[PDB]
Design a protein around this ligand. Sequence first.
Ligand code: FAD
Ligand code: FAD
Ligand code: SF4
Ligand code: SF4
Ligand code: SF4
Ligand code: SF4
Ligand code: SF4
Ligand code: SF4
Ligand code: SF4
Ligand code: SF4
Ligand code: SF4
Ligand code: SF4
Ligand code: SF4
Ligand code: FES
Lengths: 380, 129, 335, 644
Amino acid sequence: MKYLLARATDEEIQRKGECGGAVTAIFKYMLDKEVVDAVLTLERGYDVYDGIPVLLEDSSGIESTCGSLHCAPTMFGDLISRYLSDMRLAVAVKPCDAMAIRELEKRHQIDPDKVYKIGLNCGGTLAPVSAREMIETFYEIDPDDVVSEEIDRGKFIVELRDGSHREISIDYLEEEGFGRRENCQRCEIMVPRNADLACGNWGADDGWTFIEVNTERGQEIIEGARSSGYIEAREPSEKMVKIREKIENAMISMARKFQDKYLDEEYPSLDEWDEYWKRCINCFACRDACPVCFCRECELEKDYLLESDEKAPDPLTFQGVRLSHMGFSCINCGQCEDVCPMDIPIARIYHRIQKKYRDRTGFTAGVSQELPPMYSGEKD
Amino acid sequence: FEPKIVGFCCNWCSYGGADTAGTARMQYPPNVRIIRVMCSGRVNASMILKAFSEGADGVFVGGCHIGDCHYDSGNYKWKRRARFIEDILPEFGIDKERFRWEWISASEGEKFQKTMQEFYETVKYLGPL
Amino acid sequence: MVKHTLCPSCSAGCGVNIVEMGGAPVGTYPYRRHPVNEGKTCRAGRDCYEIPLMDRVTSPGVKKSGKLSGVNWDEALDKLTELLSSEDISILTTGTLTNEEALKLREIIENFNVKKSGLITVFPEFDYPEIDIRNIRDYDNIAVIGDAITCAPLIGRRIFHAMAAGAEVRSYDRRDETRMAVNSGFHITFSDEREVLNDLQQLPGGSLIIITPEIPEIIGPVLEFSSENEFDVLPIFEDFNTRGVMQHLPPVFDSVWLIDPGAAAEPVDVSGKFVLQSIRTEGLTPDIFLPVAAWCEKSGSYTSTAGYTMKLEPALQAPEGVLSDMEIFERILRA
Amino acid sequence: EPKIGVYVCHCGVNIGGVVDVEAVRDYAAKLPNVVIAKDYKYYCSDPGQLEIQKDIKELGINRVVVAACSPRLHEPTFRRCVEEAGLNQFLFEFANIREHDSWVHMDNPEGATEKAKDLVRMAVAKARLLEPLEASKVSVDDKALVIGGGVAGIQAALDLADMGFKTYMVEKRPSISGRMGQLDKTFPTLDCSMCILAPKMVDVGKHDNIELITYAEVKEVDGYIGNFKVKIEKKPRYIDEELCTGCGSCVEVCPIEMPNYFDEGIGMTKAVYIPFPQAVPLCATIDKDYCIECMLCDEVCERGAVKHDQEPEEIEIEVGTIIVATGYDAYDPTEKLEYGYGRHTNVITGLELERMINASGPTDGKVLKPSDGEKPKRVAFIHCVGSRDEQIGKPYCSRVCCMYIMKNAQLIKDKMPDTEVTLYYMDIRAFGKGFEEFYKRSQEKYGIKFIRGRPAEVIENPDLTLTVRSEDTLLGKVTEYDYDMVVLGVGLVPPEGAETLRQTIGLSKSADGFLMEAHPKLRPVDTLTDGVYLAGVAQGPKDIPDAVAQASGAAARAAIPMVKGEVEIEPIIAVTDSDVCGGCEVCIELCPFGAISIEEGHANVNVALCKGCGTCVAACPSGAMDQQHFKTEQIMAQIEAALN
Ligand SMILES: Cc1cc2nc3c(=O)[nH]c(=O)nc-3n(C[C@H](O)[C@H](O)[C@H](O)COP(=O)(O)OP(=O)(O)OC[C@H]3O[C@@H](n4cnc5c(N)ncnc54)[C@H](O)[C@@H]3O)c2cc1C
Ligand SMILES: Cc1cc2nc3c(=O)[nH]c(=O)nc-3n(C[C@H](O)[C@H](O)[C@H](O)COP(=O)(O)OP(=O)(O)OC[C@H]3O[C@@H](n4cnc5c(N)ncnc54)[C@H](O)[C@@H]3O)c2cc1C
Ligand code: SF4
Ligand code: SF4
Ligand code: SF4
Ligand code: SF4
Ligand code: SF4
Ligand code: SF4
Ligand code: SF4
Ligand code: SF4
Ligand code: SF4
Ligand code: SF4
Ligand code: SF4
Ligand code: FES
């Protein structure tokens, strides 16, 4: 079974689920049947803009984790490698989460045996505060009234407390400096085929989740969840499986256009990069947030590299060194740019360097299961 | 303008090549300073970036010819790193002409002398970094 | 596991998530939803999770001969009541209590008659405006006294935003090589406060004066100048809840009761008895120690320099044997 | 705290002529941690060495910097000088101011002097951070293991045993001999092959320095050179090797018929069998895939050597060197569907023909048609079956098929003068000694016909004759000739279980699928895995004399370390900090000598296997790996000194 249409058998889960609640039903089955010891997911805080990671040990009250949070640009790989390493686990992953976990698994920081990946289709995420400012400026509503959010026919659309829907073309918002994160606009991966399962709504009807099973482990998950009646499944029309392929191809083409824009046409000049690098406060937030920078002790803090004075570091010994260390394994997750207190576009340069390396060698960070050719023991 | 050039030369061939050039009394500009390593596989991007950040106008790396490595594969790893470094360097305003990596054998004194002369001329033409 | 809280390492109201495993803090996670920083933090904000575990003392202590020795809560409370009620005490606090705790301590002070009281701060009592830092970019002219970028990096971020949007930024300091001096549009190194005042003479109305504690002598005049010439003043206080504590207590020795649940007190001069109510006692040798709960182990509200108030629930469980400052205060009052 | 003494050598007028040695010494005197800075005319001499030794002894110097000529010329000299002075030889640094400065900048005395000052500064910067290192000594056990009991393995074992080294030979088959014992005659001399091989097999079987373990396989190999621990699984013969005499009574009374592995699928034997009369050891073996436990062998055996209750045995040996001599398998042409091997009755391979022509083979030396058991009147031979063919991924030449095809054609003509033999070839590779004369004699003496053309197809006729559809490229025309028998010149492939053994030992294979040598030209029998050597066809296809030469060479190379009894390793090796190592393992595959392993989630460098290149050190991101005498801090200090 390559493709399925699944939805939860519990009425509460399907009601609260974004797309029929199949993902929540899989997690509930996995915890209830003890396939895994825990589930790492998101859970909204005091509003839709506040998604906090949660590690559930049992399925009691799991429906609180239902729904999609487009304003939660979270990374799970770093949490799975820092603290959850010796646990059997099931985690909801966007394609960037799966890419980070794959890059960490090929470096033996995460055990692929112990981690189950129910990946989600991702068309992009938004920064919460920026999203609220956008809703105030363009939707002319109080952001606290928004109860849900989705992107679709090119449209950010918001469900409301009243019950209506407000729609704005995402092209307009992204041309006005808003909308999805800039790294999300360049994202070339939409279905997480580097995960065990790939669940989305691009080939599904209302109330159903379109699932692509990528691995035999995904097949075991789906079989165990259907046999016990946690999930009910049907098979997409192959007219649907083609609409999904076309949508994905269009999205990837738009991503390539945005790469040509941000990394070639609107790429800052050397003078603009000098202006940016003058700002750096040497806080190492980019290094800490980067999932691929996992080392117990970092070379950038050695006496012969670290900037001693309270001034901007030399861009070479900080940025160029981190680039030489991991820029072939950059997954364009944007976390480094997200956390930078100085608003430096780090991800642009790191993604451009990774793209040059990929064009030369053909290595895709976060997708290929092997190490980069840099670490090849052959004499290729 | 006298450029400052830092060189890394493997013990077995490229250091031997510079020694051969010296024994034959082949003259090249005094700008280069050579640091000795056992293999070019010892060199990484950190060394090159440090040299450029400490004030080097050009950086030279000299290894054994592909297939001649005294440790049988070190220059392959170095070549990979050198290509990636060529990718990285222009992103920070360093012309990749300032970074020269060559294969020199222990008997190629003339090759070493010519490489040093041309690298010095190139870096001098480029000007201060 | 992952719980919201406020970074206590400076006055900027940055939010951070503390990751908890097994009942102890193990790391930090971005708090993107917070409007002050949006999940961005300096190095100090990403190391704060270690504060509850660094040299933590969870047993009330008393000065036996020479060294401190453990005792129970009732004895220490009674012997503090002794000094409070009979001989004399000066109560000093840092900007590290909650607003409710500040109100309770103000009640304690007036009732037990403390002549000398207040908050340890170099800033005066001023009609400080509420200035949401998101609006700093809207100001046409900004003057900075001190190194605002280094004191609170996440407000220097907003200064950078303002410079991007055309705001003319001028910086004044005694030093010529500082991050603000380096990055501002124009910098003036001055040896006389008169030069700073003369330069501020040209600032149009509604301009923004961001003043740090680097130069304590010019704070008084500048505030005065800002009241005469109709400027908006953003102070950068020393402690995370200095502005919240300032409301209930005024800015302040023989015998001192020092309350600093955040351990943010630069050493002060004590001649007589020393009653320390903090989380760690490494620096000094107090006569009696009152271990309290940390910033993140309390229920209550904090106000940042800009004025952003934030109500907080306990992100961590207070260690057994310690009490929140308000419990100690209520015991002192009721006992 | 470092206390550095700097010594500038004039070299007569070679350095002092261009470089102002006095100014360089003065500059060196001021550098931090430099206590004394002298200069002498010839520091490579007893006077200069005595001056250096005297200052070491008198001024309490712990670091020495000589500014002179190449480390490559006189580093051992000054290392010996300082060590005799009592100072560790790795607390000495060299600055090259003659080949790198004074002989190449004769036109710029000022530039030469400034460059000399810079180089001395770099040398002092490195010296300040040097540490004392001691060379390590690794004991080498004087016992060897030879895997494979063919002609190459037999030769290697005999050579090692005759040099006095106790040897263990391990052979998976019940008897030693390999493929050479299966041949009837050898090219280019047509000499009886078993009659030259059998004496060597008997020698191996009763040699005092050889322990022969037949019918056993190498299960595990751990350790390194001189320190190999090998676990061997001796499969149950169900016959007592000590009591059995090989009389063969048990074989006669066995009611079960089983294929004989020695006959390559055209001869049969019983479930209890002796592979051939000249087997070493001459012992019986029972195969339990065919035994019915009738017990007839038990009541007929006169020595009580039948043991149906036998169990597999485990042998643990400790050796110093391993020689892999595992040989080859014949290519299986069943996949070449156009030639119809396995479908057409009268299509056979070259090895089957070797067994058929053999006078002790299943047919008693008579070449007969498998269909009707009659002598073929017409025989065709096809070259390059399974070789030089990219449709099957075998783009190499097996190097022996031409010669054995011609040998078998000559043997057929000798046995059957009136038979007609034709060979279909692309190239005739008669390259060895006497091979070209063999080629000519195939035509002049025996009248064998040679057609240049790779046959397109072999078609079976209803009467079971075979039509070979092939172009005669020299006549330039398609030919369809009929034959009573077609023989396929199958190539050489690595044997079954080659990959298992290769992973067990940790060796690397070449493109053609065979084991890889350390250097193609100058180290044909060595491997990058210290203490392991290759002999014979294990390294790649070749004929008997080449395999014998390789086996003797492998014996010599293995004996050298065992003769020495120890190996000295220079301490410029890599070292891992387990506190910083994240266990990412990206360094493991970068060592060409396999010196790095992972224990307890951290990288460990084997001291005996590290050559000190520094590739793993440069690859480690976090810096948990560092090279002694070339630490990252030292090189960074040198860079800073060179530029500042
Ligand atoms: C930011 C985002 C963008 C998406 N974009 C697309 C898209 O373009 N096209 C498409 O077809 N599908 C997209 N999806 C998936 C879509 O919501 C599917 O309908 C759904 O994933 C199918 O599973 P479900 O509805 O049964 O899951 P549910 O029962 O709703 O469970 C979803 C689970 O995902 C977890 N999760 C993991 N990461 C996040 C996160 N960042 N935010 C919120 N929840 C998270 C939730 O906590 C919850 O446990 C997106 C999802 C997210 C979170
Ligand atoms: C049809 C044919 C005809 C030939 N005719 C001639 C000729 O006339 N003249 C000539 O000079 N050459 C000839 N050759 C080539 C010749 O056979 C080889 O050069 C020679 O046999 C190689 O000997 P070896 O010891 O390297 O390998 P092999 O003869 O293959 O012996 C290898 C030994 O290792 C054993 N072994 C394999 N794997 C293991 C294992 N895992 N553990 C333990 N033991 C193992 C095998 O069972 C065998 O005992 C011919 C080859 C063929 C195919
Ligand atoms: S980077 Fe790609 S996978 Fe990650 S949130 Fe953005 S669009 Fe989704
Ligand atoms: S460099 Fe930035 S974009 Fe690339 S993987 Fe690291 S955090 Fe993500
Ligand atoms: S910068 Fe280099 S050493 Fe530091 S964490 Fe990243 S990869 Fe590791
Ligand atoms: S996060 Fe930004 S300011 Fe901090 S070290 Fe990285 S680039 Fe510099
Ligand atoms: S700017 Fe201040 S409040 Fe914000 S993270 Fe840094 S130290 Fe903490
Ligand atoms: S040490 Fe070198 S330069 Fe000095 S005298 Fe000897 S050979 Fe000549
Ligand atoms: S016991 Fe087995 S081997 Fe012996 S005679 Fe019977 S069938 Fe043959
Ligand atoms: S088992 Fe006995 S009967 Fe059989 S061959 Fe050996 S000695 Fe002869
Ligand atoms: S030796 Fe002759 S028959 Fe064998 S592969 Fe080479 S060319 Fe073909
Ligand atoms: S030594 Fe370095 S590269 Fe090797 S496993 Fe340890 S951390 Fe990884
Ligand atoms: S330094 Fe070279 S030889 Fe030594 S372990 Fe590392 S890669 Fe192997
Ligand atoms: S030894 Fe010079 S490159 Fe390896």
